[PDB]
Amino acid sequence: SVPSQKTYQGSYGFRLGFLHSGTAKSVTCTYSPALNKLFCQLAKTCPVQLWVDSTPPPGTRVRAMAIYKQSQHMTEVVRRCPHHERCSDSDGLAPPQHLIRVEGNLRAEYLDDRNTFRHSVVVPCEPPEVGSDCTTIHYNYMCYSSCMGGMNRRPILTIITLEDSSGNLLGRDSFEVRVCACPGRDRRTEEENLRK
């Protein structure tokens, strides 16, 4: 009824990482460690790093899913709003209803869960390229947090799960997301509110 959001490194020491993009007015995606919150513009690239301490088996996958953060909305499926689900901006793979897309991975699979109706996007887990220390997935969020009839100003969390080939849990991490016009300014405002 509600997916777990408990952080779980598991046997492979799985966790996320984020770039340090700053808070200039021009920034399109920026992560706040103090808030555990990603701020991004609509349909812009959000790089999310995957870190492990040891190599998981072939066939391991990485799934992303959004849920509402507030308990009174947690059972509602997070989906694109009535406008954006009809705006014909598909990449030829993501269903138009899905909030979260993976950019530039032809092996991405999009699931409409037959029992919970929740949306998710899953890719094969891959090792870092030679010369790199981690692997990065590029996500896009396809509605604003404010979209009426959709998220409608309700905060969401993205849950990233490391899964075996059957879909069993190997690791879990999560972060709040705000999709907004000015992520740099909103990160500064919310960090100031937190300090106050």
Ligand SMILES: CCn1c2ccc(C[NH2+]C)cc2c2ccc(-c3cc(C)cs3)cc21
């Ligand atoms: C989570 C992404 N990922 C990593 C992230 C950080 C580091 C540490 N670098 C210093 C190593 C790996 C790593 C090693 C192997 C694999 C895989 C191998 C196979 C066969 C499938 S995935 C994935 C990996």
Ligand SMILES: [Zn+2]
């Ligand atoms: Zn929308």
